[PDB]
Structures are given as structure tokens and as C-alpha cells.
């Protein structure tokens, strides 16, 4: 639909944004754990950060654009305090036109017939590249970019007209997205530039984002229980939550399209030409409320029908803790897969622990791998289930005040294992350190993320807001760090993370992710240990657990492509950010890989019964890969229970 520069709407800051800016600014400047001055120097850093957010791959803006703007780079502080965010806005707007200019240019390049057999390469990290000096450089980068894309599709193996067709819909889509940009999109971005400049865990959440975060925290949402996908101009219903309003109604189906949304005493609003979030916002509402939907049925027919539904509270069970039993002969081991430290998690675990007693599970594994964290209280309470009494964690503000958090007894007294990885962080680290510090449980996995701070989540809404500005939308929220957290040890998991008692092979490899790689992450330090009584002592059992574990992985087939996969991964990291761009070589590498991929499943089968059959099952099903870390962990868990039993 958009073909010209004048079809790009000029983004304008909303009426309430200034007020919000001011509110975020007050909070960040006065109450952050990090005491910084929002002076000219700080302001320039924010500007630099904003530019990277705006053009991550230094692909769209010209150095002349950057330099024009840099003249007012130290003005950012005055703007945030004032809330008159012109440079953030003026810059975003220029970026829009530049993006459009770029995409339109790419539209041209695609038509040029080029299929290539050169040896020229592409680098994926343009993060620190100097801005394009001129249009020539810009076109050249984009010439390079389009090549990369077509080449990637060709690597799938299509035609050239297809690839053109596929890429055409992509560059065009990107153009549409630009025209759909919000004032909010810019405001959120500007706040994030500011927040992240302070520390890695500080954020501004827009009203919609705030709602989402609350939902993740609570496992619940208020609306109709339907997952929505946008295809072209249409909001399509992908799936329906079981027990939810849309599903229980029997008047709505998967594949149905929502072209209209109606509030109770108002007209049905056509939402064909809308952003997904704007539509979802109309749909969602307070429980007990009613919404009417204009639905275009899934077929080719043109007739529409109106469905009215009563909004209600829906729980996202998928995000809840999950329990399973692993059986190895006579022995059983229970497993709790915890996605996050959501509010109410401890309660949920208690019932699961209760079920486990019934099954006479010998050991319990708590799976925190990839658990980002959550509520601090939840971390403390979850810990309390396994530990009789005492402090779980220590918190300290910027002025040295130290507090210790503890629980109220023990819900489960048995052998316990905590499984962690590089992505298990914060609350997960707190729980893991505590189990370890008290000698309560053995920790298995990869070294942790290294999170060591506490954030305060506070709404920006004020009580008189509705009264004086009914027309305003909701304001968002902020999360800002207020304290550092320490183990009962006096130790800190900031930067370091927690080191598992037993470490998986991926564990000893140099990690490229973590708290330590984030911008402006706070330094590691320590405090005096608190007073607590050890639950038990597992240090004795370690050499035996180690050797037994070591012997098992050595034989294990799955635990070997991991080893071999590792050295091999080591071989190419240097060239990691550079891809070949030669149609010939990638396939050698590519099929050299597919081949490797389509093979080693066989040594495991032959080792076993074998499991299944495939001379080449080159086209497998929807494949669920095995989980060796967990399977080995379970093996470790049984070893632990055996030893504890022999005390």
C-alpha cells in the first residue's frame, strides 16, 4: 500500500508521555541503587545507546545523520526531565524514512539478476561498524544484505523467481510495519535507552507490556482465552485456551477471523486494517465484562456473524510447574520443571510434593534450567519447603543496610537435586545457592547466569490520574534495581553465578552469555556471612558421585556427540560472525552437516535394542530430541539417595 516517503506518518509524542518521562526520570534518578547524575555526559551515552537501538546493524543511518544529531546529544537529560522528547522523536522519524529508503532500494536490487559463485563474505556483527559514509556505502551494504537473504533461501533450494517472490513479500511487509509504527513504539524505545544505560536489569514497561509482565507473574489473564496471529490484514484465531471463554462457547473455531470488535454500549469497530496489539487490547478486558466479536468464518465465504462473549479470568497452565516421575527399575525419581518463580509457585509445588509421596519417589530433581527468575518472595518460600529454618538470602541497599530474608515447616525432607544451566538466573540462583550453602541439595548442570541484584517493580499510575485525565491511557511501569543480594555465605552470585557440584560438559566451555557480558553490569563483591544451621553435609559424597557420573557419560553416545560437538564448535568460533556467501561451499558445509546430523542417531540405537529404523530417515517427523542432561541427572539423583541411605 505504501510507495512514497509521504506515506510514512510523522510520529508524534502522546499527550501523557511527558508526564511519564518525568515520572520514570524521578524514580531512576533518585532511587536507583546506582547513584548516577543525569548530566551531559550521561546524556551522551544514552544517545549512543538509542542509536544502536534504532539501527543495530549499522545499516540505515548515515554518518551525516548521526553527526547532525550528535550536536544535541547532551540535551537528552533536559528532555527526559521535561518530557519533551524531540530528539528521540526527530531521530526516530528520520530513521523511519531511512528504513523506507533502504527497503525500497532493496526492492530494486532483487530485480537485478545475480546468482553468485564468488568467495565474498558476510559478517553478522555490524554492531560496532562505522556508519555508512555515503549513499554508495549504504547501497553497497544493502546490496550485500539482499545477497545474503536470497542466498539463504536458495540454500533451501528454490527457484530464483520464488526467492524473489518470497523476499518481495518480506521487504514489502517490513515497509508495512514502518507505516504501522506507534508513538508508543518510540516512547518505549527512548525509555529503554535510558534504563539500560543505568544497568542491565532496569526497564520501562509500557502499559501493554506491564500487563503482560503481570500475567507472566500471575499465570493469568483477563479476556477470552484465545491466542491470536495476524496474517496480512486479518486477525486469525490460532488456538483456544481450554476452559476459556472462546473455547467453552462453541461458537468460535480455530481459523476464524476477527474483523470486528465491540464494546458493550458501543459500535462494532472494524479492525481489518490494524496492528495486532491494538486489536488484542480491544478484545481483552475485565472479567465479567462482555465483548462482541465480528467473525469472518474460515472458508471462502464472505458472510459475517457476531459472537458475544463474557470475559473471564484464564490461567496459563502451560507456564505452571510440572511434575513427572522417572522410573529406573524399582526406584523412582520425581521431577519438577519450573519455568519461572511465578506468584503462587510454592503452593503449586506443595501439592506436587504431596503427590510424590504417594508414589514413593526416592529422589527429587528440581529443574531450573532456563528459569529466568521471578518474585523474590517466591524464591524464599520455595527454599523454605526444603529447609527447616533460617535465612535464605541477604539483601543490601546502596548505603550498607543489610537485611536477611527468611521463611515462617519443611515439606520435603528427601534427597534433592537442583538442575541448572547458563540460563538459570536470579531467584533460581538464590534457591540454588541456598540449597547448596545449607548442604540441602546437590547442584548439577552448568554455571549460572550471574545475576545478583534485586529490582523494584512500581507502577507509574497515581491515584488522581483518572480523575484529572480520564482521557489518558494507562501509564506503564518501571523495574529498577534497589539492592544487591548475597548468599547466606556472604558470597555473591553477581557475575560469578553458582558453580554446580557436578558439571555437565557444556559447563566447562567458555560461555559467551551471562550477567558479565551485559552493559553496565554491577561488579562482584561480598559481605559477611549470616547465621544459619546446615541442613546436612554432602561434601563427603562428591568423589564417588563424580567418578560414577564420569564413567557413565564416557560410554554414553549422546554424551559424546556433545563432547565432539564441542571441540568442533571450538574450531569455528573465530569465523563465527562471518558467513561464506558462496553458494558452492555452503552445502558442502551444509550437507556435510545434514549428513552428520542424519547419522549418529544410529550408534545409540545399535547400542540399545535398537530403538527405531532408518537407513536414512532424512525426512523425520516432528521430532522430539532426547534429554541427556536430565537422564544423567536422574542417574545422579539415584546415586545420591543410595549414599544417603548408607549413612
Amino acid at each position: 500500500d505504501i510507495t512514497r516517503a509521504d506515506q510514512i506518518p510523522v510520529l508524534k509524542e502522546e499527550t501523557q508521555h511527558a508526564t511519564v518521562s518525568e515520572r520514570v526520570t524521578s524514580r531512576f534518578t533518585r532511587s536507583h541503587y546506582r547513584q548516577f547524575d543525569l548530566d551531559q555526559a550521561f546524556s551522551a551515552k544514552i544517545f549512543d545507546r538509542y542509536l544502536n537501538l534504532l539501527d543495530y546493524s549499522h545499516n540505515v543511518l548515515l554518518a551525516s545523520d548521526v553527526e547532525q544529531f550528535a550536536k544535541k546529544k547532551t540535551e537528552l537529560g533536559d528532555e527526559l526531565r521535561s518530557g519533551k522528547l524531540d530528539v528521540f522523536y526527530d531521530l526516530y522519524n528520520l530513521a523511519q524514512k531511512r528504513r523506507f529508503e533502504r527497503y525500497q532500494y532493496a526492492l530494486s536490487v532483487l530485480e537485478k539478476p545475480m546468482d553468485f559463485t564468488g568467495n565474498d563474505t558476510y559478517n553478522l556483527d555490524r554492531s560496532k561498524a562505522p556508519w555508512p559514509k555515503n549513499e554508495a556505502e549504504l547501497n553497497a551494504l544493502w546490496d550485500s544484505k539482499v545477497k545474503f537473504d536470497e542466498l539463504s533461501l536458495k540454500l533451501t533450494g528454490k527457484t530464483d523467481k520464488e526467492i524473489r517472490e518470497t523476499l518481495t513479500r518480506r521487504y514489502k511487509f517490513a515497509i508495512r510495519r514502518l507505516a504501522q509504527t506507534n508513538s508508543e513504539d518510540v516512547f518505549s524505545l527512548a525509555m529503554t535507552a535510558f534504563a539500560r544505560e543505568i544497568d542491565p536489569h532496569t526497564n520501562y514497561l509500557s502499559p501493554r507490556n506491564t500487563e503482560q509482565f503481570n500475567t507472566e507473574m500471575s499465570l493469568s489473564l483477563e479476556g477470552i482465552g484465545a491466542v491470536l496471529q495476524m496474517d496480512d490484514d486479518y486477525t486469525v484465531i490460532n488456538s483456544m485456551v481450554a476452559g476459556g471463554p472462546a473455547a467453552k462457547s462453541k461458537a468460535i473455531s480455530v481459523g476464524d477471523k476477527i474483523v470486528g470488535v465491540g464494546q458493550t454500549g458501543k459500535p462494532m469497530v472494524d479492525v481489518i486494517g490494524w496492528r495486532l496489539d491494538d486489536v488484542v487490547a480491544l478484545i481483552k478486558g475485565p472479567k465479567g465484562s462482555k465483548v462482541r466479536l465480528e467473525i469472518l468464518p474460515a472458508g471462502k465465504g464472505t458472510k459475517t456473524r457476531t459472537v458475544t462473549l463474557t470475559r473471564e479470568r484464564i490461567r496459563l497452565e502451560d507456564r505452571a510447574v510440572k511434575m513427572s516421575v522417572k522410573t529406573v527399575g524399582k526406584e523412582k525419581v520425581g521431577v519438577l520443571d519450573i519455568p519461572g518463580f511465578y506468584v503462587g509457585l510454592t503452593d503449586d509445588v506443595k501439592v506436587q510434593l504431596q503427590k510424590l509421596e504417594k508414589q514413593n519417589v526416592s529422589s527429587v530433581i528440581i529443574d531450573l534450567r532456563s528459569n529466568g527468575g521471578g518474585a523474590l518472595t517466591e524464591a524464599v518460600s520455595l527454599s523454605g519447603l526444603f529447609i527447616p529454618a533460617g535465612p535464605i538470602v541477604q539483601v543490601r541497599d546502596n548505603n550498607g543496610k543489610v537485611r536477611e530474608d527468611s521463611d515462617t515447616q519443611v515439606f520435603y525432607k528427601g534427597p534433592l537435586v537442583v538442575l541448572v544451566d547458563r540460563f538459570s538466573a536470579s531467584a533460581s540462583e538464590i534457591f540454588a545457592a541456598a540449597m547448596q550453602d545449607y548442604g540441602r541439595a546437590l547442584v548439577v548442570g552448568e554455571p549460572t547466569f550471574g545475576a545478583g541484584t534485586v529490582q523494584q517493580y512500581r507502577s507509574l499510575n497515581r491515584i488522581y490520574d483518572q480523575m484529572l485525565r480520564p482521557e489518558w491511557p494507562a501509564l506503564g511501569s518501571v523495574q529498577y534495581t534497589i539492592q544487591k543480594f548475597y548468599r547466606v555465605n556472604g558470597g555473591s552470585t553477581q557475575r560469578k553465578g553458582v558453580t554446580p557440584d557436578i558439571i555437565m560438559p557444556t559447563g566447562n566451555e567458555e560461555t559467551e552469555t551471562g550477567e558479565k557480558f551485559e552493559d553496565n553490569a554491577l561488579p562482584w563483591d561480598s559481605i559477611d556471612a549470616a547465621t544459619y544451621v546446615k541442613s546436612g553435609d554432602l561434601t563427603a559424597f562428591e568423589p564417588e558421585l563424580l567418578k560414577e557420573h564420569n564413567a557413565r557419560i564416557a560410554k554414553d553416545p549422546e554424551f559424546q556427540n556433545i563432547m565432539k560437538d564441542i571441540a568442533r564448535f571450538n574450531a569455528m568460533k573465530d569465523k563465527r560472525n562471518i558467513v561464506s556467501l558462496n553458494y558452492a561451499v555452503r552445502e558442502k558445509e551444509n550437507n556435510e552437516d545434514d549428513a552428520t546430523r542424519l547419522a549418529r542417531l544410529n550408534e545409540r540405537f545399535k547400542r540399545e535394542g535398537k530403538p527405531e529404523l532408518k537407513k536414512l530417515d532424512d525426512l523425520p517427523k516432528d521430532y522430539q530430541e532426547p534429554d541427556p542432561y536430565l537422564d544423567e541427572t536422574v542417574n545422579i539423583a539415584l546415586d545420591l539417595a543410595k549414599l544417603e541411605k548408607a549413612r
Binding site: 500475567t215 489473564l221 479476556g223 477470552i224 482465552g225 484465545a226 491466542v227 491470536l228 496471529q229 490460532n238 485456551v241 495486532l276 496489539d277 486489536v279 488484542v280 478484545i283 481483552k284 496459563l316
Partner: peptide, 4 residues
């Protein structure tokens, strides 16, 4: 993919 958003939930409403």
C-alpha cells in the same frame, strides 16, 4: 502470537 498474542493471547487475548
Amino acid at each position: 502470537a498474542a493471547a487475548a
